[PDB]
Amino acid sequence: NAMSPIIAPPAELVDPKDRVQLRRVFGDFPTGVTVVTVGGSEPRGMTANSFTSVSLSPPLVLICVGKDAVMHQRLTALPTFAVSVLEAGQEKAARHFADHSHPPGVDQFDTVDWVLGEESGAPLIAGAVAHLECAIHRLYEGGDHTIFLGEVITATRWPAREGMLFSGGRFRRFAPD
Amino acid sequence: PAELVDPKDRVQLRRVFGDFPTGVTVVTVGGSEPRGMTANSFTSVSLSPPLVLICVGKDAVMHQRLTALPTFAVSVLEAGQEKAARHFASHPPGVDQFDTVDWVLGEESGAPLIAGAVAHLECAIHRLYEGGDHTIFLGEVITATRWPAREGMLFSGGRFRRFAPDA
C-alpha cells in the first residue's frame, strides 16, 4: 500500500533497559500455555509460555525458568520434568500455576485434576492437549533465567483438543478455520 | 481418545510439537549476502539482560550466516503476512530474497527488517548452544520497535490460524 508508511499506526521505540517496554514487545509474539511440573516429596507446577520444540533427532525441547521461581531449584534438584500443553478451556489450571500464586509449604495440586507421570514422576494435568515427559539434558545460561534443554522420553496427545493461546498478556482463542 | 507418541518416530513427534501454538517470525541478517528465514522457534528468555533465542537447523543456509555474523534481526509477522512467511520458508545461497518484499534497513543490526511487522528486534549474538539437530542462538536485544495496533500471525497443527476477536 502506497501510504502504509505514513499511515502506519503509532510505532513505539522500545529501550531494552525499560523493563515495562521490553515486556510489551516480548508479549507481541503469540504462544500456547503450558504447565511445567516436577515430582519429589512436594510436587510443583509453573505456568510457562517459554516452551519451545528444539530438535527431532534426538527429540529435544526447551523451557526457560526464572531464577526467581521456586521451580528453578526444584528442576536442578530433580532432572526430570513434565510439560502439559493446556487446552482452551483450562484457564483454571493456567491461573492456578501462574504468578507464583500458590507457594510451597502446602500441596499445590489439590484443586486441579492430575495423573502421575510414570517416566518423570511428575503430575500431568488432566484435560491437556498433550503431555510430554522429559529428562533434563543440558542447562544453558539465560540471563535472569536458565534454559533447560530436555530430551523427550514419552508423550501423549489428544488430537480433538485445541490449545490455549496467550498474547499481549492475555488469554486468547482461535478463530475457527 | 489418547494417542500415544513414540518420540523416536519423527512423524509422531512432529505432531505433538505442532500442538503448541506459536507466532511466526522472519529472522534476518545483513552482511555481504543478506538472508532471511521464517522461524517459529523464537522465544524471549530474559529481561535483564534482555535476551531472546532462536533455534536454527544445522543444515539451513541461515545457520552458516548466524555463526559468522555478530548481529541479527527478528521480525514478528502480523496476521496478514502469510505471503512473507511463505517467501522466506526457497532460494539458493546466491539468489536475492528481498527484491520482491518490503523491508527497511535496521541501523543497529545492519539487517533488513520486514515492513508491516508487529515488532522488530535487533540483536547481538551472545552465545551458541547445542540443540541436537539445531543450534540455539541466544541474542541480546539492542533495540526494538513495536506496533501495538497490529496482531501476530499464528501457527498451529502445521497450519496458519487466526485469533478470534478478543471478547
User: Which of B3, B46, B150, B162 should we substitute to test contact with A (largest number of A Cβ atoms within 10 Å)?
Assistant: B46
Distance of CA A156 to the CA centre of its chain: 17
Do you find a cis peptide bond into B49, omega within 30 degrees of 0?
yes
Give the phi and the psi of residue A77 in degrees, each rounded to 5. Answer: -80, -30
Q: Which residues contact A120 (CB under 8 A, 6 or more apart)?
A: A37, A38, A39, A80, A81, A82, A133, A134, A135, A153
The grid cell for B54 is 532462536
Per-residue DSSP letter, A1: -
Instruction: Report whether A27 contacts A166 (CB < 8 A).
Output: no
Q: Which residues contact A73 (CB under 8 A, 6 or more apart)?
A: none
Per-residue DSSP letter, B166: -
Q: Mind giving me the DSSP string for A106-172?
A: S-S-SSS-EEE-TTT-SEEETT-SEEEEEEEEEEEEETTEEEEEEEEEEEEE-TT--B-EEETTEEE
Residue type for B23, please? G
CB contact under 8 A, B161 and A144: no
A137 marked among binding-site residues: no
Instruction: Report whether B108 contacts B71 (CB < 8 A).
Output: yes
CB contact under 8 A, B163 and A172: yes
In our burial notation (b when 16+ CB lie closer than 10 A, e otherwise), range B58-70 reads eeebbbebbeebe
A29 contacts in B (CB within 8 Å)?
22-23, 25, 42-44, 76, 118-119, 152
Give the phi and the psi of residue A2 in degrees, each rounded to 5. Answer: -50, -35
3-state secondary structure of A114: strand
In sign, the C-alpha dihedral spanning B150, A165, A62, A139 is positive
Q: Does A3 touch chain B (CB under 8 A)?
A: no
* Resolution value (Å, 1 decimal): 1.9
CB contact under 8 A, A31 and B45: no
Q: Does A41 touch chain B (CB under 8 A)?
A: no
Per-residue DSSP letter, A71: H
Q: Does B55 touch chain A (CB under 8 A)?
A: yes
Closest CA to A43 of A100, A103, A94, A109: A109
Residue keyed to cell 533427532: A57
Instruction: Report whether B15 contacts A152 (CB < 8 A).
Output: no
Q: Does B161 touch chain A (CB under 8 A)?
A: yes
CA distances from A153 to A133, B16, B18, B159, B163 (A): 6, 13, 17, 26, 32
Distance of CA B4 to the CA centre of its chain: 30
In sign, the C-alpha dihedral spanning B13, B20, B42, B90 is positive
Looking at domain B1-167, does it have CATH number 2.30.110.10? Answer: yes
B126 marked among binding-site residues: no
Instruction: Give ∠ CA A118-A120-A125 in degrees, rounded to 5.
Output: 80
B134 marked among binding-site residues: yes
Q: Does A53 touch chain B (CB under 8 A)?
A: yes
Alpha helices in A44-165, H assignment, sequence order? 70-77, 91-96
CB contact under 8 A, A26 and B44: yes
Q: Give the closest of A11, A129, A159 to B145, CB-based.
A: A11
β-strand partners of B46: B51
CA distances from A109 to A128, B136, B142 (A): 15, 33, 41
Instruction: Report whether B115 contacts B147 (CB < 8 A).
Output: no
Name the experimental technique: X-ray
- C-alpha B22/C-alpha A167 separation (Å) is 10
- C-alpha B14/C-alpha A130 separation (Å) is 12
Instruction: Report whether B55 contacts B41 (CB < 8 A).
Output: yes
Residue keyed to cell 555474523: B69
In sign, the C-alpha dihedral spanning B89, B95, B101, B103 is positive
B4 contacts in A (CB within 8 Å)?
156
C-alpha dihedral over A69, A74, A76, A82, to 10 degrees?
-100
Residue keyed to cell 497443527: B157
Please tell me the CATH code under which domain A1-177 is placed.
Answer: 2.30.110.10
Kind plus residue range of the DSSP H or E element containing A31 = none
3-state secondary structure of B111: coil
Q: Give the closest of A163, A167, A177 to B152, CB-based.
A: A167
Closest CA to B151 of B75, B82, B79, B83: B79
Q: Does A136 touch chain B (CB under 8 A)?
A: no
C-alpha dihedral over A59, A65, A71, A72, to 10 degrees?
100
